[PDB]
Write a protein that binds this ligand. Structure first.
Ligand code: B12
Ligand code: B12
Ligand code: B12
Ligand code: 5AD
Ligand code: 5AD
Ligand code: 5AD
Ligand code: MG
Ligand code: MG
Ligand code: MG
Lengths: 173, 173, 173
């Protein structure tokens, strides 16, 4: 006990950096599910987020599958197209937003507040994904971490779109 | 400052593995409290979850109390009966559920979404509980970690029971 | 990739203890935003929490700014006045509360449940803040960690104020 398996049945510590990486993707997936279930976004944002939840499972499958020279069967890996899709969504959803000069106090709607929670969890997942690469520079792909990086940018953008209180700004004083 | 006490007044780093373990049990307890307060489960599931919250405090008391040869007064420890009770709940609640072939996108009801959040926090708590044992193989009991392990199985089962959207499945594509 | 910048443009690992500290302040800020957006506290508690969200950004700016002998421009730092303000709020809000003899099961209202979630995240942020100091005893200030320490005391107090189920107590049995 205290051990479990990767996608290739390889035994691993429940403390393992790869497992912590795709476990945090799970936590991020749940956080996005909470934003959907309690924030009730419009149908278009709902479809975007549901697609991200699908992507996050693709990222966890990538992280749970060691990189090998020639595998038994082709592995599921994140690709740059995943990230370019997030970039496209960022541009579209950020186009109507006014310019931001300072930090925003997270909150507002249930949807915007929960998108902020998901943002911070996703960024925690990203930190874990980079720690997985640091531990296995040759065995772990960096695209999962790069996908999580841009996802937090998108979640921040969507949190602003969804906020009816507008941008409540941080006054350093 | 930066130090605190275990159950025996022993001084400990606020970074300590045992403290991180029972602190994550606290976070898991709060997550379950959110599922209750926002998901409004039926009275039967409410009683199950409230009992788990009670168990989690028993687990934290176990984790905060070093194992010693003969203690001043008898310690509160998790027992196999705690875990067998969770196993019994898993079987009962999983009996009516259809067979699952793939991963589920967390979400659906407020209750099912928040049970997914609690699931991922509990699994984070489990990882912390195993790290506590690794650091003190002789001083920390493994039953807290084993209880958290099966609790995440139950929370997954309950999340399916509570979901009115059924199982929204991950399409790897 | 896998690197980012502190407030002084210094390059840093996305695993860095200082970054993990002010990232957890962000997560705590979001958690408080969720309590506001879903718990709908009265106007007075709303103003207290919004002020704390402002303080947390001040703490993150402190943590992201290395301590130096004579800086280019004066840094934003947490002060004892921040903490004394939290102490004042604790006393006021705890005055009407009955004496507590045991642990409370987190939950109750949406507000009180989410204040418990925020409490546990803030305590996680505190642990991270102390780890930042341990890593840079001379470069990181301890007042951010001390502010987070007392904030968790206040959030516990407010969670009791907000709970309509009163104190649901842990029975170790
Ligand atoms: C990595 C991993 C995860 C990671 C990341 C997964 C991801 N993002 O892709 C995380 C931590 C998120 C995870 C979570 C869970 N997992 Co998991 N996981 C694994 C693992 C190791 C690899 C999965 C994978 O990525 N395969 C790669 C993809 C491409 O394979 P695939 O073509 O989709 O085929 C998979 C599915 O059909 C899946 N599957 C088949 N039947 C079932 C039934 C259920 C309920 C689930 C969830 C999956 C499942 O298993 C196949 C092989 O992986 C497998 C064991 C293994 N060695 O394969 C366990 C495994 C799939 N996990 C399992 C379980 C139980 C779960 C959890 C319910 C644990 C929990 N209580 O929280 C959750 C469910 C989360 C959710 N939303 O559905 C079980 C499912 C079997 C069962 N009926 O008990 C497995 C088989 C391990 C085990 N034997 O206990 N897991
Ligand atoms: C481990 C520990 C926890 C851990 C795990 C606890 C668990 N799962 O059992 C965690 C991190 C979850 C925790 C949380 C908190 N704790 Co604590 N904790 C401790 C500790 C170290 C041991 C508790 C224990 O498990 N005892 C074993 C069981 C079997 O003992 P028991 O028979 O139940 O007797 C206990 C209770 O009566 C309890 N108690 C007595 N009066 C009060 C009043 C309050 C408000 C609470 C919460 C408890 C409490 O203290 C007795 C001795 O432990 C004690 C200090 C110590 N050395 O005992 C502090 C202690 C109980 N904690 C304390 C506090 C303040 C809290 C928090 C409010 C901190 C916060 N701001 O979040 C939260 C409350 C969480 C909740 N839902 O109620 C205080 C309570 C005293 C007070 N009035 O200020 C103590 C005494 C430490 C201190 N002096 O500051 N804690
Ligand atoms: C530390 C830090 C944070 C930390 C802690 C911040 C804190 N608690 O104070 C955390 C992790 C919380 C954080 C979060 C984010 N940050 Co930040 N962060 C930094 C950083 C390194 C220092 C900020 C600071 O504390 N300055 C000290 C205070 C006193 O300075 P100030 O007088 O307030 O001046 C600042 C503001 O005007 C701010 N600013 C100016 N324009 C904009 C626009 C936006 C959208 C934001 C959020 C801030 C911002 O930048 C100035 C210089 O820091 C800067 C880069 C740098 N080297 O300065 C990036 C920076 C401010 N962050 C940035 C971003 C993108 C974000 C996030 C949106 C990331 C995300 N996707 O989650 C979130 C927003 C969180 C929120 N609620 O608003 C950007 C903003 C620029 C832009 N338009 O893209 C910067 C400039 C880095 C970058 N170039 O990518 N960050
Ligand atoms: C926006 C600012 O937040 C910090 N930063 C960058 N990436 C992350 C992450 N994944 N998690 C937390 N903080 C991060 C850096 O300091 C950056 O400059
Ligand atoms: C279900 C899959 O999730 C991983 N796994 C097992 N236990 C945990 C845990 N506590 N936290 C996160 N991931 C876990 C293993 O890879 C297992 O096979
Ligand atoms: C109240 C009890 O909780 C533990 N404790 C103290 N500070 C923290 C923290 N920031 N996070 C988690 N647990 C903590 C100590 O054991 C203390 O005695
Ligand atoms: Mg980034
Ligand atoms: Mg398990
Ligand atoms: Mg404290």
């Amino acid at each position: 006990d205290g051990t479990t398996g990767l996608s290739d049945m390889s035994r691993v510590a429940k403390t393992d950096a790869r497992l912590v990486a795709y476990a945090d993707c799970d936590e991020a997936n749940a956080a996005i599910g909470a934003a959907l279930a309690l924030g009730h976004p419009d149908t278009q944002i709902t479809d975007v987020l549901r697609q991200i939840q699908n992507d996050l499972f693709d990222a966890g499958a990538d992280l749970s599958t060691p990189i090998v020279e020639n595998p038994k069967h082709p592995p599921l890996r994140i690709a740059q197209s995943y990230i370019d899709r997030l970039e496209g969504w960022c541009d579209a959803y950020n186009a109507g937003l006014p310019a931001l000069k300072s930090f925003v106090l997270p909150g507002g709607s249930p949807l915007s507040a929960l998108l902020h929670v998901a943002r911070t969890v996703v960024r925690r997942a990203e930190r874990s994904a980079w720690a997985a690469v640091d531990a296995h520079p040759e065995g772990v792909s960096v695209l999962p971490a790069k996908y999580l990086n841009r996802l937090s940018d998108l979640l921040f953008i969507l949190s602003r779109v969804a906020n009816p209180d507008g941008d409540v700004l941080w006054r350093p004083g």
